[PDB]
Amino acid sequence: ADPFESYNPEFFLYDIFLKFCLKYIDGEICHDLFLLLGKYNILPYDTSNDSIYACTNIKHLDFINPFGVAAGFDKNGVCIDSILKLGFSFIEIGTITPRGQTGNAKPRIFRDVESRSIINSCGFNNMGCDKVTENLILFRKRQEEDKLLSKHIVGVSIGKNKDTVNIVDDLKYCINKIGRYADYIAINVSSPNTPGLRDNQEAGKLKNIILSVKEEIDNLEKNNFLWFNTTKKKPLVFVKLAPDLNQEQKKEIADVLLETNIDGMIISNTTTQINDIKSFENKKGGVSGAKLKDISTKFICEMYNYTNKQIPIIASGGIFSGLDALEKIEAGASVCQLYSCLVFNGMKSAVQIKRELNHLLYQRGYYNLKEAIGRKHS
Numbered sequence: 001a002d003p004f005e006s007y008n009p010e011f012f013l014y015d016i017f018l019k020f021c022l023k024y025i026d027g028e029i030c031h032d033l034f035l036l037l038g039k040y041n042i043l044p045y046d047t048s049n050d051s052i053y054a055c056t057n058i059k060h061l062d063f064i065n066p067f068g069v070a071a072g073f074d075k076n077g078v079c080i081d082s083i084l085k086l087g088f089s090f091i092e093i094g095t096i097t098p099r100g101q102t103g104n105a106k107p108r109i110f111r112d113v114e115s116r117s118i119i120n121s122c123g124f125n126n127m128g129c130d131k132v133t134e135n136l137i138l139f140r141k142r143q144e145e146d147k148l149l150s151k152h153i154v155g156v157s158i159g160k161n162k163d164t165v166n167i168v169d170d171l172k173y174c175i176n177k178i179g180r181y182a183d184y185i186a187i188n189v190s191s192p193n194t195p196g197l198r199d200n201q202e203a204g205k206l207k208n209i210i211l212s213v214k215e216e217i218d219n220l221e222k223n224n225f226l227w228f229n230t231t232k233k234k235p236l237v238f239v240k241l242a243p244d245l246n247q248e249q250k251k252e253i254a255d256v257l258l259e260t261n262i263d264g265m266i267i268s269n270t271t272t273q274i275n276d277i278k279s280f281e282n283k284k285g286g287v288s289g290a291k292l293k294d295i296s297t298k299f300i301c302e303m304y305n306y307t308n309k310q311i312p313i314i315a316s317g318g319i320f321s322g323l324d325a326l327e328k329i330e331a332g333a334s335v336c337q338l339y340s341c342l343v344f345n346g347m348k349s350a351v352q353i354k355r356e357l358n359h360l361l362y363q364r365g366y367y368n369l370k371e372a373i374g375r376k377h378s
């Protein structure tokens, strides 16, 4: 790929445009501008074949490379194709809710370039389960005609509308509408921006949530070719956890995860523990990026040991480099999700991080990425 060709994600003009937008334009306007470029398929694309030695898996989920885009980036599944073609193996769309929501008062997204941090108080703004399902169906039909997207994975993050009293009613509604089209379902009980959502991480409540979601997915088969997704199998079930939990809570959750046989755990969502970023002093919400890296890596180590290495991990939190990715993997993660990396590193994010990790796996003496999983604990 030529360095001065516009189709190349590493093309210098992308970093110039991004640096300008990061300096002078409102955060959510930048994000919506990126989604618009994606929607009209004007984004650059990765033309390199991914290394077979950096492939990974979670059960039957075969990731072509270890990098995906975390939930909350393409909330409505409006440009799945364009984001994936930047060089990512998967994307988690959503978080979606049964009815659409505009979310919390704007401005609600703020970036701190020096510390590579983001604070947000979005509050699950999305078009609603029915409209997002239409968007995902359209992608599944495009994927069926395009061989280049046949191995890319799409997960769906599901949550509850703000006014819903019982979360399970909302999760069931989403499963019944979008479940048939998802490779995996991520249960979001960790947003800090929906009042009382995090209370669902209590052991007793979480167990009922997991068993009800699993029962609802299992009933799609019982009541009714059926799977219009990548795997051609029922979606796996993941739980996304908050890093703001005590040791007693983490241990109780781990015991529930082992008993309910969850397919994976996403570690982690944003934190409410970071109070040292000056430009975020009077801002509300959860913090993402570099200040979240150490907290979430420590949380991966803890959960990997609490679950006795039986539950696969999806890493989320401050991953910017090949070095950051390897640290997550040796801590116990099987795959990585990026968010803040796309915001601060731009279009080149996937191409660059994949190169850095392949080089690092070679320097460290690993034959493949699978050999590195949980190696800190070996």
Ligand SMILES: Cc1cc2nc3c(=O)[nH]c(=O)nc-3n(C[C@H](O)[C@H](O)[C@H](O)COP(=O)(O)O)c2cc1C
Pocket: 070, 071, 072, 073, 075, 094, 095, 109, 118, 119, 120, 122, 124, 157, 188, 240, 268, 269, 270, 288, 289, 290, 292, 316, 317, 318, 319, 337, 338, 339, 340, 341
């Ligand atoms: C503006 C914004 C919106 C987000 N929305 C969601 C969401 O809807 N669902 C979710 O599970 N996580 C959401 N997240 C959390 C990210 O998926 C991710 O876990 C977090 O940003 C930490 O990763 P990072 O340090 O690489 O950014 C959001 C993050 C940001 C910055």
Ligand SMILES: Cc1nc2c(C#N)cccc2n1-c1ccc(C(=O)NC2CC2)s1
Pocket: 013, 014, 015, 017, 018, 021, 027, 028, 030, 031, 033, 034, 109, 111, 118, 342, 343, 345, 346, 347
């Ligand atoms: C990767 C990228 N590239 C661009 C370009 C370019 N080139 C122009 C405008 C926005 C761009 N982006 C962004 C995508 C998302 C961005 C962002 O700031 N998101 C909000 C949640 C924090 S900034």
Ligand SMILES: O=C(O)c1cc(=O)[nH]c(=O)[nH]1
Pocket: 072, 095, 120, 121, 122, 123, 124, 125, 188, 190, 191, 192, 193, 194, 269, 270, 286, 287
């Ligand atoms: O929509 C949001 O506010 C949101 C959801 C989530 O899970 N995490 C986050 O930081 N923001």
